[PDB]
Amino acid sequence: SLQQQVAQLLEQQPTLLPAAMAEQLNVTEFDIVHALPEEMVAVVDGSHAQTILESLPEWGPVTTIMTIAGSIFEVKAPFPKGKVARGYYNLMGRDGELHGHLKLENISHVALVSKPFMGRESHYFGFFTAQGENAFKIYLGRDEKRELIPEQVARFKAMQQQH
Amino acid sequence: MESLQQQVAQLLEQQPTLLPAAMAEQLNVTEFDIVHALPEEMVAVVDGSHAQTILESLPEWGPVTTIMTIAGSIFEVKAPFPKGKVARGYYNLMGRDGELHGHLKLENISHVALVSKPFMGRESHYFGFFTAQGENAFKIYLGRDEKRELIPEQVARFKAMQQQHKQ
Numbered sequence: 254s255l256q257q258q259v260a261q262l263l264e265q266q267p268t269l270l271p272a273a274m275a276e277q278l279n280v281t282e283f284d285i286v287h288a289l290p291e292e293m294v295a296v297v298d299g300s301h302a303q304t305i306l307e308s309l310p311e312w313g314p315v316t317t318i319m320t321i322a323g324s325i326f327e328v329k330a331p332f333p334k335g336k337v338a339r340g341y342y343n344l345m346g347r348d349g350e351l352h353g354h355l356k357l358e359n360i361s362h363v364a365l366v367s368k369p370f371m372g373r374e375s376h377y378f379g380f381f382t383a384q385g386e387n388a389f390k391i392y393l394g395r396d397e398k399r400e401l402i403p404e405q406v407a408r409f410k411a412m413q414q415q416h
Numbered sequence: 417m418e419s420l421q422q423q424v425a426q427l428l429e430q431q432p433t434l435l436p437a438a439m440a441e442q443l444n445v446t447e448f449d450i451v452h453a454l455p456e457e458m459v460a461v462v463d464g465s466h467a468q469t470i471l472e473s474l475p476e477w478g479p480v481t482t483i484m485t486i487a488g489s490i491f492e493v494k495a496p497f498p499k500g501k502v503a504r505g506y507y508n509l510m511g512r513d514g515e516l517h518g519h520l521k522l523e524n525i526s527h528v529a530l531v532s533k534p535f536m537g538r539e540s541h542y543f544g545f546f547t548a549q550g551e552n553a554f555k556i557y558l559g560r561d562e563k564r565e566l567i568p569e570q571v572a573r574f575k576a577m578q579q580q581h582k583q
Contacts, residue, residue, distance in 0.1 A: 386487065
């Protein structure tokens with residue numbers, strides 16, 4: 254299939270994030286995610302990710318990344334809690350946190366993903382669409398030092414196969 | 417069959433709550449077309465070439481709310497605006513604590529709008545950033561205090577800016 258059809262580049266062409274390889278292979282970033290090595294990804298049913306999202310505050314510091322029009326926005330803070338109101342998954346941040354409303358209903362799939370970049374591991378949650386597009390991602394937060402909380406990564410790997 | 421301007425004004429008086437994106441769906445146009453069709457007093461449109469400059473002025477302003485929309489999900493950052501420096505591909509943001517971090521492609525912003533349109537029945541102002549396609553990349557709303565009111569300084573500054581680019 255595709256995974257096999259191009260694992261040449263990863264990580265022989267190291268440093269290639271899924272979104273960009275999508276272009277070389279002309280398939281959704283999700284297609285790449287599916288095509289990633291089993292070690293690398295942990296694909297999940299996308300329906301009602303509000304509970305996985307609800308677990309997020311416990312984790313600690315995280316970085317929330319959304320990219321629109323080629324601009325990248327990231328907020329480095331603990332994930333907000335949340336409640337469902339007016340049909341959406343709404344805000345629950347108090348300070349320096351993330352707001353405000355998340356239509357998760359349009360999220361078809363969630364992929365827990367861990368791919369090392371530039372000689373360094375990288376672990377995040379990738380949120381997708383039926384279209385396969387990448388709505389946004391949650392990268393594991395980091396200490397004062399450049400990388401990750403040791404407690405969190407354990408949860409990340411613990412996710413596969415399931416808790 | 418009226419001008420887009422007339423359709424939009426009509427839409428204002430009949431459905432004030434409607435956001436310009438929603439309006440965009442309503443009349444089957446890009447968001448820039450509505451914002452540009454808004455009543456003359458209500459909006460200034462400045463070249464995207466000046467985008468950077470405007471952002472460079474914002475860290476002084478104080479706390480603002482940067483909002484973006486992806487896949488029906490809306491994301492808001494209530495914080496002051498980070499200073500920035502152009503490196504490699506982008507205008508890179510230097511965020512501290514609560515401030516937002518990122519890399520903005522100011523080259524792919526063809527237009528910047530200063531829009532004074534009431535939000536949820538209240539006084540509201542925002543900077544809109546538009547691609548060449550006419551889609552709204554992101555918005556920067558003027559900040560509110562704890563008592564839910566705007567900040568006099570920000571509104572004075574923003575109004576003066578509108579006035580400038582109104583020629």
